[PDB]
Amino acid sequence: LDQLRQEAEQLKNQIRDARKACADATLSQITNNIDPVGRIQMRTRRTLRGHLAKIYAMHWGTDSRLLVSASQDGKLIIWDSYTTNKVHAIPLRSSWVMTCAYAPSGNYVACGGLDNICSIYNLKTREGNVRVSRELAGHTGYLSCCRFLDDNQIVTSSGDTTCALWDIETGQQTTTFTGHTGDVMSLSLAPDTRLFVSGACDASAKLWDVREGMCRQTFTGHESDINAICFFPNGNAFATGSDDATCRLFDLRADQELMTYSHDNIICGITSVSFSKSGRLLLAGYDDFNCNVWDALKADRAGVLAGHDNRVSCLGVTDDGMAVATGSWDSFLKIWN
Amino acid sequence: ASIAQARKLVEQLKMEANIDRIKVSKAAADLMAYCEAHAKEDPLLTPVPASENPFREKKFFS
Amino acid sequence: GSLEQAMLDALVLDRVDFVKLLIENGVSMHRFLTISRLEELYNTRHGPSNTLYHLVRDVKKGNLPPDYRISLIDIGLVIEYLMGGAYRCNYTRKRFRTLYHNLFGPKRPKALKLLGMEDIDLDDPEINHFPFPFHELMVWAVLMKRQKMALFFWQHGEEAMAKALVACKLCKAMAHEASENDMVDDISQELNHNSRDFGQLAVELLDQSYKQDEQLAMKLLTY
Amino acid sequence: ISKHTQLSPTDAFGTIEFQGGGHSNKAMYVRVSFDTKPDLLLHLMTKEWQLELPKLLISVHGGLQNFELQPKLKQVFGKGLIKAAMTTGAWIFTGGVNTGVIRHVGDALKDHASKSRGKICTIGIAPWGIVENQEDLIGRDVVRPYQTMSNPMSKLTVLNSMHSHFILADNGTTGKYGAEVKLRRQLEKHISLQKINTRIGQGVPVVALIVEGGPNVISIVLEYLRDTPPVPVVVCDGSGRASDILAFGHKYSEVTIQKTFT
Amino acid sequence: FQRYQLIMTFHERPVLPPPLIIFSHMTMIFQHVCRDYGLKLFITDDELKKVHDFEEQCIEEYFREKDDRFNSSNDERIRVTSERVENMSMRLEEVNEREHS
């Protein structure tokens, strides 16, 4: 019996033509009569030094004060952004670590990368320093990204074409996020934390619930690995950044790309992508040494931040929304405001 | 015969389509009010000066 | 492959006579020694107590995960810290860091893109052969507080005077560090005795070299 | 094959180091054909290795089998040979491969260098095809590491350490002997025809030393006792084989059935 | 010991007296915009291998001399003589005890 083989296209093609009929008034032909904002250029305000090796990742907190950062020398450091002083310097077991995130309340932090393990650190110990608290295992491939929802539940992204919502106390997982044929890099969570997205080497994204994780929606159309994705603050849209010098924006209900970036000066891929707190200012780092800030609703290059000696690796946005931090491969970290 | 791999194929394909996709005009009628009502709420469109800015420059005039 | 494991067992347990017997019975340190053997020798648990854990804790900031494995880069850092200001060991050099990068990391062929190192896996059986193994063996013996092993490894290989002087400086620095960190005050005496013995050996060798020939001995100190 | 071997120039000569041995030792070696004229070999040994002419030459023909001598006999023999070759500048000619009596000579040299100074020019002349590592010795004028560890399953014999100079002979074969006895005898005869420093006119004395050995030992000793410059021989009665048989037969000089030892 | 420090800190010093050293300070400014002897000595590979052989020969001779000197003291000779005398006395007593007539 191979009738399911020949039943694939009809189910695929009915959705394929469904997205075609939804194109009647695109984003450009609607935002034409909105307020023009012009060009806005930022300047360096505060710099972060102390990491001899190149940084790899970072993530802002609720207070927009303390920043996690995993460097190529296997060292973790928190950053009090008011004075850029050394507060909590943390070592790592391996020299190759990639993942770091900030807690919802600044309680626990975790690390990952090629170590194939997920270790959780207790910043709020009763001894005065930070020691190992819990441990996770099972992700056979390289760990790519991890994020915190609360002090009991955590989610992560891994390169073994799978993800899992893990139970911290007992060490097991709940749902295994299966279906991608490629390595899943980053995930973006909705503000209500009910449905959230994915992205792998399949040049497509998958929508996942936080409770069951049904394969809700597919967002295909790219030509390379889905490197970085960020969620729109309304929880009904997200952007897909890839290494094919293009980045695509999708939404929930329409199951179709919203808008593209019309700038062929971008000849390399996009390292990180992040939305504004509203969905108007777009930030992106690339393989080249230029940081083309972007406009989300006017689809315009918002500005260029060329102040890094090496490639820009990670990107961050303040919760209050006045400064932008860019983590590059020059062993530095600068505050743009 | 070995149709177990394609059994997973037809399950999601018949569950993926069970949703309604709005026209892009409606999609272009959704986030414009969302962005404009949050345009003033987000300082990334209106740059706040050095007063509210926690990243303000220190000046010790003594 | 059996005498190699026997040599490893004799090295871990600090049995110098067995090492001498095996060396005199066919095995060679050039073929035996490699990166994996050295990095597992530095992380042994048998044998006499050593102060390496406190040194690695003091280096790379005061915090450290408890069940931690010490790699060769940490050894390079602690050696550079003990030696002096302008000293620059071979382990921390970019060549050795890139060569050691091929121990883990390329497990995922897509991961090398993410790490983004700026960098050739020669056909050498493994290009994982230390050119002068006895230098690293003597350094390991000194750092793990095994005087007999160090005195045995000193007389083989090349650069006897340089090895003796480096051993003396390292023992003195370790003695000072352990004295400052409120030890049992006998480890300081043992390390100081080791330093004095190595210095005496270096002086005696210089005396012999000057007694033999003036010009070669003069060249030895300055080259 | 009717010795159909191509005559190409040599490409193996220089110094080696015996990695894995107890003592780090340096020896110099070349590789020459089995029809090489002795005069050019003498010139090579004299100028290229800075060797002076000896006052005495010792030949150590023995048995090519790993035989063990009882204690208080091999120690005396080794110390006597080392003393006789150390007090007098002499060239000890041995097989060179680590087999048979050559291993005993090597151990005798091992027990001497650890206590006393001085060097013995223990020249070993071995066939090229029997070494365990045929490669790794192709480096010319460059020091080449050598592995002293020998695995019996390779069906080959490694070069013995503690020797000073090697002369490797080849006829195109591999894994078989027979390409060095004529060359060794010709070199010995050419050395014996050379003139020592004294103006008496006396040539370099030559002696032969026999320990154990098979039926070819009788052939070589009868060849030695025949030549126009006849040389003496010395045997040891503690070996066990035909050397001990010759020692027993040395008694009652001038029972022919007692030789049926099977 | 401090003679070396004196020599090094004078070899580092510029070549003018302090009244005239100000002109060397200006010359350093021009060198800003743009140890074969005294500290070290760079040798070739042949000389390096000769030095290696020499130092190995020296250390071998040193060990041999030290062992020979130790083996020829009075205390070591007395100890060895005492041990062999005890062993020989025990053996001779055993031989004398076992008699067949």
Q: Between chains, do C24 and D22 touch, taking CB under 8 Å as contact? A: yes
Q: Is B26 helix (H, G, I), strand (E, B) or coil?
A: helix
Contact C73 A93 (CB under 8 A): no
Tokens for C68? 């931690």
Nearest to A279 by CA among A317, A228, A227, A225: A317
Report d(CA E57, CA E7) in Å as an integer: 32
Query: Using CA atoms, how far apart are residues A99 and A155, in angstroms rounded to an integer?
Result: 12
- The residues, any chain, with a CB within 8 Å of residue A316's CB and separated by 6 or more, are A58, A59, A60, A67, A274, A324, A325, A326, A327
What's the CA gap between C95 and C88, in Å, rounded? Answer: 13
In the numeric block, which tokens belong to residue E5? Answer: 């420090």
Q: Kindly determine whether residue A254 and residue B41, on different chains, have CB atoms separated by under 8 Å.
A: no
A98 touching chain C per CB within 8 A? yes
A221: left (phi over 0), alpha (psi -120 to 50) or beta: left
Q: Do A297 and B32 touch (CB under 8 A)?
A: yes
Pick the closest to residue A85 from A67, A73, A106 (CA basis).
A67
Report yes or no: B52 at the A interface, CB cutoff 8 Å. yes
Separation of alpha carbons A85 and C166, rounded Å: 37
Structure tokens at A290: 């230029």
Half-sphere exposure of D35 (CA within 13 A, CB side): 5
Cα→Cα distances D28→A175, C115, C207, D74, D156, Å: 72, 51, 32, 28, 21
- Asked if residue A272 lies in contact with residue A241, where contact means CB atoms within 8 angstroms, the answer is yes
**Rounded distance between C-alpha atoms, residue A110 and residue A88, angstroms:** 14
Q: Do C68 and A93 touch (CB under 8 A)?
A: yes
Option in A45, A254, A297 nearest B24 (CB): A254
In one-letter notation, the amino acid at residue E46 is D
The answer to whether C216 contacts E54, with C-beta atoms less than 8 Å apart, is yes
Nearest CA in chain D to C29: D20
What distance in Å separates the CA atoms of residue D89 and residue D98, rounded to the nearest whole number? 24
- Which of D4, D29, D32 is closest to D14 using CA atoms? D29
The residue type of E76 is E
Answer whether C208 touches E (CB < 8 Å). yes
> E33 to chain C nearest CA, in Å?
25
Q: Which uninterrupted H or E stretch holds A137?
A: strand A131-137
Q: Strand, helix or coil at A245?
A: coil
- A70, A55 in Cβ contact below 8 A? yes
Phi, psi for D29 (deg, rounded to 5): -145, 155
Q: What are phi and psi of D18, to 5 degrees?
A: -90, 85
Cβ contacts of residue E60 below 8 Å, gap of 6+?
none
Spatial distance between the Cα atoms of D27 and D18, rounded to a whole number of angstroms: 9
Q: Which residues contact D107 (CB under 8 A, 6 or more apart)?
A: D78
In contact, A172 and A136? CB cutoff 8 Å: no
Find all residues with CB under 8 Å of A274, minimum gap 6, and list them: A230, A282, A283, A284, A315, A316, A317
Q: Cα Rg for chain A, rounded, in angstroms?
A: 20
A294 burial class (0-12, 13-18, 19+ CB within 10 angstroms)? Answer: buried
Q: How far apart are CA D211 and CA D224, in angstroms?
A: 16
Edge-to-edge strand ranges of the sheet holding A108-113 = A97-100, A108-113, A117-122, A131-137
Number of structural domains, chain B? 1
Domain boundaries, position A53: 3-336
First-last CA distance in chain A: 63
CB-CB under 8 Å, C223 with E40: yes
Q: Running DSSP on this structure, what letter comes out for residue A31?
A: G
- How distant, in Å, are the alpha carbons of A41, C218, C223, E11 from that of E6? 58, 20, 21, 9
Return d(Cα A104, Cα A60) in angstroms, integer: 10
The Cα–Cα gap between E92 and E101 comes to 17
Helix (H) or strand (E) holding D19: strand D13-19
**How is A54-117 classified by DSSP, letter by letter?**
PEEEEE--SSS---EEEETTSEEEEEETTTTEEEEEEE-SSS-EEEE---SSS-EEEEEETTSE
Judged by DSSP in three states, A272 sits in: strand
Which residue in chain C is spatially nearest to E53 when comparing CA positions? C158
Alpha-carbon distance of D224 to D234, in angstroms, equals 12
Q: Which CATH number covers residue A220?
A: 2.130.10.10
Interface test with D, best of C20, C23, C28, C152 (most D CBs within 10 A): C28
B36-55 exposure pattern, b = at least 16 Cβ within 10 A, e = fewer: bebbeebbbbeeeeeeebeb
Tally of domains in chain A: 1
In this complex, whether C and D touch, counting 3 or more CB pairs under 8 angstroms, is: yes
Virtual torsion, Cα E28, E31, E32, E36, nearest 10 deg: -90
What CA–CA distance (Å, rounded) separates D223 from D61? Answer: 13
Q: Are D160 and D96 in contact (CB under 8 A)?
A: yes
Domain with B24, as residue range(s), is 1-62
**HSE value, Cβ hemisphere, 13 Å, CA-based, for D199:** 0
Question: Are the CB atoms for A308 and B40 separated by under 8 Å?
Answer: no
Q: In terms of C-beta distances under 8 Å and separation of at least 24 residues, what long-range contacts does C52-58 make, across chains too?
A: C52/C78, C52/C143, C52/C144, C54/C178, C54/C181, C55/C81, C55/C82, C55/C174, C55/C177, C58/C177, C58/C181
Q: Which residues of E touch C219 (CB under 8 A)?
A: 41, 43, 47, 51
Q: List CB contacts of A30: < 8 A, sequence separation 6 or more.
A: B25, B28, B29, B32
- Residue among C66, C71, C116 whose CB faces A132 most closely: C66
* Contact between residue D130 and residue D86 where contact means Cβ atoms under 8 Å apart: no
> Quick one: tokens of D210?
């026999």
What letter would DSSP give residue A331? S
Method underlying the structure: cryo-EM
CA dist E53 → C150, C202, C215 (Å)? 22, 17, 14
Residues D91, D123 contacting (CB under 8 angstroms): yes
Neighbours of E78 (CB within 10 A): 10
Q: In chain C, what's the furthest Cα-to-Cα distance?
A: 62
Structure tokens at C50: 């050593």
Residue recorded with tokens 């071995």: D126
Which of the residues C4, C7, C24 would you substitute to probe the D interface, choosing the one with the greatest number of D C-beta atoms within 10 Å? C24
The answer to whether the Cβ–Cβ distance between C30 and D149 falls below 8 Å is no
Q: Do A329 and C110 touch (CB under 8 A)?
A: no
- CA separation, residue D113 to residues A107, A109, B5, D163 (Å): 71, 66, 76, 12
CA distance D129 to D169: 8
Name E10's Cβ contacts closer than 8 Å, sequence gap at least 6. none
Residue owning tokens 């560890």 = D149
Q: Name the one residue in this structure whose structure tokens are 């990204």.
A: A145
